[PDB]
Design an enzyme around this catalytic site. Structure first.
Site: not given
Ligand SMILES: Nc1ncnc2c1ncn2[C@@H]1O[C@H](CSCC[C@H](N)C(=O)O)[C@@H](O)[C@H]1O
Ligand SMILES: C[S@@+](CC[C@H](N)C(=O)[O-])C[C@H]1O[C@@H](n2cnc3c(N)ncnc32)[C@H](O)[C@@H]1O
Ligand SMILES: [Zn+2]
Lengths: 262, 51, 262, 53
Positions: A66, A70, A92
């Protein structure tokens, strides 16, 4: 050319900043990494010139670090900047929270003499506090990536709310698989057992991505984690194992006692 | 039909409050099908991303 | 009657989420706690029916426990809900991040059989990652209220980014003053010296509240903290004092090693 | 002054204009020399004085 990385939050359409939305709206080009197809359509209607970063992920069950993915993401973003496009990257949640693509793109843009900045967004962590009605300041808060917690020496404070991110790939070193195994998770439980009893209640949390969707707030004893149904978006919450205790050492230096606390 | 509704609902607090008062009524009024509504009420997102 | 607590972010006007702004627009009544008069004016134009919670803070040199202030805020919010108003509470940043008023109002509202919820916002923490180009996932992060760190037993992980919130009142045990003393800060330095050398570079951070304003990112040795100019809005960032060490025990159970870390 | 700031914080087009040429944009919105000075010196206290807070 310039670069602005924004976050779109977790929920569809509503959880992005007013300013951040405006950035997307006025961008020459947008590079997106969004949770679903509903979010994708929303974006495209906001600004039709979109390139989906998802494409750079392995397509045909191929093995691909990965970190290579990236790199291609970053280079694709920088290509638009170098060409002179007012470029916006839409990720997101919060663009700089557990997300290297933006930090990397910004670092690289700055070094090549381009304007680049990151606008903060609403992260999964931010959603968690709200959904679970928890203030991280109550007894403090710690966050670690699950795998890093396993690979390196982190010592958690058991009075705090502890978060382990990316719990679904805990112990998955190659960074090629989309999930880990139950044995890897069992090793994590044993590790955690240094500070938390096996019957300690933990929480599998998933913030909703759609407005008609309720969040996942699944409670279970730590020992049952390895059998749990984990998804890439899952975060593991480990509430305090102990209540706050008085720090008599410092109180003494302050010349006060518990009873003097306001 | 489905995508447009969700985008509105997520952005518009008035509609959000309307929806939370009466999910089925609001959904039906925005032309969602019975299967789509069922999907929402059972919390089957996967089926939503199909419908 | 119903209650929705929203956050307005740190920056003026643009850092609130789209949905959260909409809640403010359509509210019967708004209770506000905002950083300045510019943000206050912005709010009033959005919805004229505002009650400013500031009024409940100690007025005119009066001695008042800040807990009493919070109670009066909470009660004022509930009064509108109980009267049957569609009530919105608008706090700066994230409404539930180091902020008890919203959590308390939601708990109390729910118990009296009213609909109540919290929408996540962009917090000072979120701003910090962006401003300093730090990803909290890199080596993890920890947050503690400075005073609580002194009064109770908390042990930081020195490989992670540590945040101490409300550093300006660190050791102000009465909760009646708006700032602490240099002696209290000296005791905090001594305490921190357990994990961090006196010459360890720390950062006093203040996110900007206005679009024409640059953030405060003031770097200094830990030893100089007691002489520093701190504000209520100041947060102290303490970067890692140690590089990560391999967790050979777990790596072995995983059947991997450093060179095997992809 | 307050009207300007509210717009600037919300509008990415104006924001980008501003960062290109702060003084030009500020003068274009009728900000005084004193107000502009305060912005350029980063004196927030003075700004709040020059609006009546
Ligand atoms: N809908 C969701 N609910 C809870 N944790 C989430 C999520 N989407 C992403 N995550 C968390 O983020 C990790 C991916 S890394 C991405 C994080 C994102 N930038 C943020 O701001 O949250 C997942 O493995 C989990 O730990
Ligand atoms: C009562 S808490 C409010 C926090 C707010 N809810 C948030 O989301 O950041 C006040 C503390 O938050 C932090 N804080 C508030 N405003 C800040 C700012 N502009 N920059 C940095 N930290 C800030 C400081 O630690 C301050 O002592
Ligand atoms: Zn955090």
């Amino acid at each position: 050319g310039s670069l602005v990385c924004v976050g779109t939050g977790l929920q569809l359409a509503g959880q992005i900043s007013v300013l951040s939305r405006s950035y997307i709206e006025h961008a020459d080009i947008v590079f997106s990494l969004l949770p679903d197809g509903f979010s994708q359509r929303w974006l495209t209607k906001l600004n039709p010139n979109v390139i989906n970063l998802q494409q750079f992920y392995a397509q045909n069950g191929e093995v691909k670090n990965r970190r290579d993915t990236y790199e291609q993401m970053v280079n694709a973003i920088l290509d638009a900047v170098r060409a002179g496009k007012k470029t916006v990257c839409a990720l997101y949640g919060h663009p700089g929270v557990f997300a290297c693509v933006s930090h990397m793109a910004i670092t690289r843009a700055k070094a090549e003499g381009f304007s680049a900045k990151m606008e903060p967004g609403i992260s999964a962590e931010a959603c968690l506090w709200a959904d679970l009605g928890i203030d991280p300041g109550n007894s403090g808060h710690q966050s670690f990536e699950a795998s890093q917690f396993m690979f390196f020496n982190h010592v958690p404070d058991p009075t705090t709310h502890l978060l382990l991110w990316q719990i679904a790939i805990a112990g998955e070193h190659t960074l090629t698989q989309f999930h880990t195994s139950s044995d890897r998770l069992q090793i994590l439980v044993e590790q955690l057992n240094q500070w938390y009893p096996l019957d300690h209640e933990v929480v599998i949390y998933e913030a909703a991505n759609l407005p008609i969707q309720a969040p996942r707030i699944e409670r279970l004893p730590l020992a049952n984690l390895p059998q749990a149904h984990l998804m890439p978006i899952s975060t593991l919450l480990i509430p305090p194992a102990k209540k706050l205790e008085y720090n008599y050492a410092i109180l003494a230096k302050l010349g006060i006692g518990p009873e003097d606390l306001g | 039909g489905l995508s447009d509704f969700f985008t509105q609902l997520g952005q518009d607090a008035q509609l959000m409050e309307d929806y939370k008062q009466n999910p089925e009524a609001v959904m039906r009024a925005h032309g969602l099908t019975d299967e789509q509504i069922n999907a929402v009420m059972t919390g089957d997102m996967e089926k939503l991303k199909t419908l």
